[PDB]
Amino acid sequence: PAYRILKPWWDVFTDYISIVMLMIAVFGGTLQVTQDKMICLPCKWVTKDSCNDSPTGIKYDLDRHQYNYVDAVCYENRLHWFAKYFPYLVLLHTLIFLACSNFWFKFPRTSSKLEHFVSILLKCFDSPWTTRALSERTKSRIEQGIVDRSETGVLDKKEGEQAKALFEKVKKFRTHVEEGDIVYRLYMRQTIIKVIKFILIICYTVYYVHNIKFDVDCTVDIESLTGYRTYRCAHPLATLFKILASFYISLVIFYGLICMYTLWWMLRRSLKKYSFESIREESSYSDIPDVKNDFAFMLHLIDQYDPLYSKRFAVFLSEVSENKLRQLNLNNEWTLDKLRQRLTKNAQDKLELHLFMLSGIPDTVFDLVELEVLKLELIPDVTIPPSIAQLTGLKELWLYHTAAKIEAPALAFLRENLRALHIKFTDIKEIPLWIYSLKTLEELHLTGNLSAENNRYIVIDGLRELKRLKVLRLKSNLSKLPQVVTDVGVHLQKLSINNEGTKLIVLNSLKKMANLTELELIRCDLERIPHSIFSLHNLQEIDLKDNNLKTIEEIISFQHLHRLTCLKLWYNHIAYIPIQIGNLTNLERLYLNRNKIEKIPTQLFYCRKLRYLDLSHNNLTFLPADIGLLQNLQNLAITANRIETLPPELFQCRKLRALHLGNNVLQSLPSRVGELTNLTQIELRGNRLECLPVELGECPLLKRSGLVVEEDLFNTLPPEVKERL
Amino acid sequence: PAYRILKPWWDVFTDYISIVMLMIAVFGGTLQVTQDKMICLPCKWVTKDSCNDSPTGIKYDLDRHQYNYVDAVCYENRLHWFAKYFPYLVLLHTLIFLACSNFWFKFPRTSSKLEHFVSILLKCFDSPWTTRALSLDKKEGEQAKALFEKVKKFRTHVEEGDIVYRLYMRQTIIKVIKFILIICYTVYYVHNIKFDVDCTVDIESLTGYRTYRCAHPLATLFKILASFYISLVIFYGLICMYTLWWMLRRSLKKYSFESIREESSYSDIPDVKNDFAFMLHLIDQYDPLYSKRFAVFLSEVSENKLRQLNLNNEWTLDKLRQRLTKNAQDKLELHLFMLSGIPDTVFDLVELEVLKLELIPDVTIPPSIAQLTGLKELWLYHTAAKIEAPALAFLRENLRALHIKFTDIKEIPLWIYSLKTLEELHLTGNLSAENNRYIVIDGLRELKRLKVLRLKSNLSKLPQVVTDVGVHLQKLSINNEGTKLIVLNSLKKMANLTELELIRCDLERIPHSIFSLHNLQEIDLKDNNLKTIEEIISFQHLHRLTCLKLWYNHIAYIPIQIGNLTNLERLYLNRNKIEKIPTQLFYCRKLRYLDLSHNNLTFLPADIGLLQNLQNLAITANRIETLPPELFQCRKLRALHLGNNVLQSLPSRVGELTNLTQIELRGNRLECLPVELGECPLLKRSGLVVEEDLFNTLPPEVKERL
């Protein structure tokens, strides 16, 4: 694996230098062992030393054998020890350089981190995901760039899984390697020792060259054995060894110069610190990490092998890349088969789908042409890719605290759709300035707490142009409603304020609007009904509940209005009903629930078209004979009021489909109510009935679904209601 | 591998010569170590002339050991300097030349370029796309595309390099320098190789004799080796000099594909001017075929074809036909919503009068439209606009209607004025005052032929290009924003105006420049800020109004000037909260269609019984009590839409008409329904939405009969 981490001036030159150094050691060694003769010969003209101060010949008269002895003595007991062991010296130095350059290689405490690093290196130029990743007023409303750049391509569960595995591995391997700096320390130590040995070697070997000589004056003490005292002696190899020493010294200098470069490099710039600054300078990916340890160091070393590596690695190790990967992987798995698992519907169905557990917006959801409603919950980076064009209808979109980043170029589609839009928000500005750009939005639901200032800025710029707004629901404190509401208010059909922090005067709004065909004040801290509410001639519905409203005495002037048709007064403190309610007959709904009503005058009977009445959780203990006049009564609750046994007027009606009786006193339901034949359900609970009537057989719609009873015995009818079930 | 980037008359020869030269160093080295003896011997003749010539023996009483000393001395400080180190001179230079040859390989900043270069060439060489490109099974697209992306990134990277070229030149130059020097030294120092030499070293104090004659035993082998060596080197040098000639008389820093371009299918190839060019020349030397395969692969024209084929192989004629539908004014509506371009197969659909394109980049519609017969209508929305096909005649014979939608300003093409046969145009988009004025002039000014024009936009002011073109205007519509109601000099210019529509515009009051337009014959005012009908008094004096829609407004009051009109075929009083209807509508006995809904009427007047031709009557969500008997005093009442009112039961008599085709009964709280209603021949569960069977006699009979 060394090849892919091969260092330009650390491994390349060192290996060739080392080979040459070894070669010269071997050459010299071979010669030193067998070609070194050291030819000595005696001399007669000895004056002081050197046998000088001087044809037939000399005739020294010595034995050929004894000359070899002299040679051996002069060789052993004289100078030039450097020359004698020069190739061994070279071999040692060569081996030192070779060994010191390769401690990390094949040594487990360092090779482990290199193996993890190299494994990554071999994946950066593989796993095609990498090369896909390498392919690269406003008012936060423009993102067509990313729409076309992604090319809506896929990974086919191959690049997806490969890249995912590599993300797990790059994060884990980095966490492992990043713990320390052993790889770093070894290279700094190695670089320094190479320089140290270099300096010492040159000093040592350039000095001992004066030792290599043509000849030597041999003055060893052997004349008592061999006759002559002084010998002159030649060393033929000495010429060659001066040459070899010179070549070795030059070779070491070259090595040294390169080693100084590498030591120079590792000191001039920090190597542990490392980041892909060059990538964020050139590439679209600014998401560049920086760590200071062995991982970064090893990346830095290979940065000088090939910049291409850095480009591949840098784009891979990114959260931008991972997020694009995840969205693509989402599409790979979250297909039509998975979307179908959640295609539910609740009421006014419109074929819903709610995506809650997704980390982003799938593209496959827009293949669900049949749906009209899409609910997005807690999903970040919602752009709504402009591939919603294959949908036909889109009647409702829920931005349930997701993201304000809706910038895809598909307003034309949305402007032909989205009758309704729901925005849930906990922050102030995650509400996009996108809403007003929609023109066909009729219904808008805004839920979250904004200050008066925030209401004014968000509503004026984000909503004011919704000329077709007909329905507006504000689940906000609304200490003041911005003038936008009153202006849309003249075309607005429904306005609903539903919050505990509601404390304000709405008289101006009511007067300006003068329409409000549906009005809701829920949990608003109200005690007083604003009197201008009676200018809403087309009010047609009013829901006053969960208020501090303790009176109905104020509803005197309701006849100023026409077609009221509905009055909801539940969960309030109206413990008493006056005789103004009897003048309200153009009413088709009335609800008095948990208001602690002690008494109701016979006034409800005047509203002979009431048909629907809720009398519950009131300390009333009474039923008037209004019930005998309202012969179109279809639904009535008489519960939690401790009423005595029901009076016979109970059944003097025609339908009373919903007969809800409970938490009262009823030893027995008047059996005659069973002859209405239109009972669909009878609730008989908490009343201590002794027995059940056996006249219910007359009614075909009291099969065992509507028999909400405690006893379910004392009868002959159980098999009839069971078979009908 | 490296083989394919080796130079034909350079590298194979360099390697063989280097091997032989090293062989000479090895032979000579071994020879020099064990065979060089220098047998020297003294002489007694005149030493002034190296022992000249002016049987038993000479004896020369010296010992054998002493002679070894003489030989050693003569060898060490006399002649044969060159011969003594000849094989080392050979080894050193041979290694230098060899190292120089391989210098560019395994070099820190050349290997990466070379490895990628070779891999790309091999992939291009063997890719089936290259073959097809010479003129995909849905996989060659991906493979070729991946190679194209890699090639573009590789080329971009190599584009900035000048390393491979320069290092090669430095290498060539140093080989030439060393070549000249090695010849100068090797050739010159040959006079020192002699068999017979004269040794006159000063060793008399040790040997008696000063002059020795001496025989170098390997003089001949070193002369032979040197001569053979010199010849090897000269040959090597010829190649080195050739290299410089080739490198200097050819730019090589640039490479053109002209010799291939005029033989192959492509034309779009740039002049390469960097290390890529140099590498290209080198493969051209090895084999030009690789230059060709690469060139054929790397082409934008080829990429275009590759992608086009991918479209054609997916969006086949069956795929297109299966997805071909029709919704209104049918004409074979084919929709292409997410394509990367337009497949050619769409133009073989000769019968495809309607093509709808959206979200398709770079649409160009190559002129193959001549293949088609009918192309009566074309919808280009939110796509691209690069159709410059030289085939206006085909387009002019067709394209009676164009529906083009935009998101910006400059996206709008000008293919409108060039088609003077255009009859109907629809434009939606982002407008401003000046932006619209400039574009509408360039777009519509010359279309005298235009009859129908509809604009969906934030216009804010009516342009005069439209009023001038508008003198031939049949139908005019504008919506989604209020404009200055420039009517005083617009309706008068247009003057034909046989169908006018105003939707979601800031109209509170009706303009009165329409009052004299007797040729109006159709008018639709809806979702406006209009809250009245006071203006419509003299308006209706015009004959042939035939249609008046005032729905979706705030008109809660109907006057009795409505009786001024006798010619109306459509009347819509929808969602205006009206509280009463006068018996002044019947005046238009040709009305036939009357929408009374989402009002606050609560009752109906005796007007229905005066319209014997009333066919379609909608009475819904008006809280109306039991309908008056005039309800069924008619002849047709095909559609009786009742709902969200108050009706205990239908009068049995309405079912005796028998021309009822549908009765809607939803939300009216009916207690029961009479049997006569089931006698009507066309109420056999034909759209008879009811809540319950309502105690009728023949609901299962009519269900089976249908």
Residue A369: DSSP 8-state? T
Q: What share of chain B is helix, strand, coil (3-state, %, to 5)?
A: 40, 15, 45
CA–CA dist B166, A304 (Å, integer): 19
Chain discontinuities in chain A, listed by preceding residue (C to N exceeding 2.5 Å): 54, 136
> Is residue A685 helix, strand or coil?
strand
Contacts of B687 (CB under 8 A, 6+ apart): B661, B662, B664
Burial class (CB in 10 A: 0-12, 13-18, 19+), B229: buried
* Exposed e or buried b per residue across B664-701, where buried means at least 16 C-beta atoms within 10 angstroms of its C-beta: bbeebebeebbebbbebeebbeeebebeeebebeebee
A41 touches B at CB < 8 Å: yes
A504 touches B at CB < 8 Å: no
Cβ separation of A234 and B72 shorter than 8 Å? yes
For residues B383 and A148, is the Cβ–Cβ distance under 8 A?
Answer: no
B407 touches A at CB < 8 Å: yes
Report how far Cα A556 is from the mean position of its chain's Cα atoms: 59
Side chain identity at A504, as an amino acid letter?
L
Side chain identity at A36, as an amino acid letter?
D
B156 touches A at CB < 8 Å: no
Cβ neighbour number for residue A224 with a 10 Å cutoff? 7
Give the CB-side neighbour count of residue B645, counting CA atoms within 13 A.
26
Q: Which of B69, B76, B504 sits opposite A239 (nearest CB)?
A: B76
- Residue appearing with tokens 């080195």: B240
Q: Token digits for A181?
A: 């700096």
**SS3 letters for A238-298?**
HHHHHHHHHHHHHHHHHHHHHHHHHHHHHHHCCCCEEECHHHHHHCCCCCCCEEECHHHHH
> Is residue B640 helix, strand or coil?
strand
CA–CA dist A304, B112 (Å, integer): 11
Q: Token digits for B673?
A: 């329904």
Quick one: resolution in A?
4.4
Q: Token digits for B228?
A: 């053979």
Contacts of A415 (CB under 8 A, 6+ apart): A437, A438, A439, A440
Cβ separation of B600 and A35 shorter than 8 Å? no
How far is CA B328 from each of CA A439, B333, B607, rounded to the nearest angstrom?
Answer: 25, 9, 35
The coordinates were experimentally obtained by cryo-EM
Determine the residue of chain A that is closest to B357 in CA distance: A389
Q: Token digits for A281?
A: 């300078």
B149 touches A at CB < 8 Å: yes
- Render A10-71 in DSSP notation, one character per residue: TTHHHHHHHHHHHHHHHHHHHHHHHT---EEEE-S--SSSTT------------HHHHHHHH
Query: Diameter of chain A by CA atoms?
Result: 172
A239 touches B at CB < 8 Å: yes
Q: How far is B80 from chain A (nearest CA, A)?
A: 13
Cβ neighbour number for residue A692 with a 10 Å cutoff? 21
Contacts of B159 in chain A (CB under 8 A): none
A137 touches B at CB < 8 Å: no
Picking from A414, A436, A439 by the largest number of B CB atoms within 10 A of its own CB, the best residue to mutate is A439
Picking from B92, B359, B648 by the largest number of A CB atoms within 10 A of its own CB, the best residue to mutate is B359
How far is CA B468 from each of CA B415, B464, B515, rounded to the nearest angstrom?
Answer: 19, 6, 20
> Is residue A258 helix, strand or coil?
helix
For residues A56 and B61, is the Cβ–Cβ distance under 8 A?
Answer: yes
> Is residue B364 helix, strand or coil?
coil
Q: Token digits for A456?
A: 């004014």
Contacts of B69 in chain A (CB under 8 A): 39-41, 234
Residues in A 42-101 with any Cβ partner in B closer than 8 A: 43, 45, 51-52, 54-60, 62, 64, 67
Cβ separation of B61 and A59 shorter than 8 Å? yes
Cβ separation of A234 and B69 shorter than 8 Å? yes
Cβ separation of A389 and B337 shorter than 8 Å? yes
Side chain identity at A412, as an amino acid letter?
A
> Is residue B312 helix, strand or coil?
helix
Cβ separation of A8 and B108 shorter than 8 Å? yes
| Pairing state between β A290-292 and A273-275 | antiparallel
Side chain identity at A49, as an amino acid letter?
D
Q: Token digits for A597?
A: 């009503």
Side chain identity at B351, as an amino acid letter?
E
* Residues paired with residue A542 on neighbouring β-strands, in sequence order: A519, A567
Cβ neighbour number for residue B483 with a 10 Å cutoff? 19
Picking from B205, B403, B578 by the largest number of A CB atoms within 10 A of its own CB, the best residue to mutate is B205
Side chain identity at B262, as an amino acid letter?
E
Contacts of B65 in chain A (CB under 8 A): 39, 41, 62, 64, 67
> Is residue B169 helix, strand or coil?
helix
Q: How far is B243 from chain A (nearest CA, A)?
A: 27
Tell me how many degrees the CA angle A254-A256-A258 measures, rounded to the nearest 5. Answer: 75
Interface contacts (A, B; CB < 8 Å):
115
B480 touches A at CB < 8 Å: yes
Q: How far is B96 from chain A (nearest CA, A)?
A: 12
Contacts of A12 in chain B (CB under 8 A): 106, 108
For residues A637 and A612, is the Cβ–Cβ distance under 8 A?
Answer: no
Cβ separation of A390 and B337 shorter than 8 Å? yes
Q: Which of B61, B206, B623 sits opposite A232 (nearest CB)?
A: B206
B205 touches A at CB < 8 Å: yes
Report how far Cα B111 is from the mean position of its chain's Cα atoms: 33
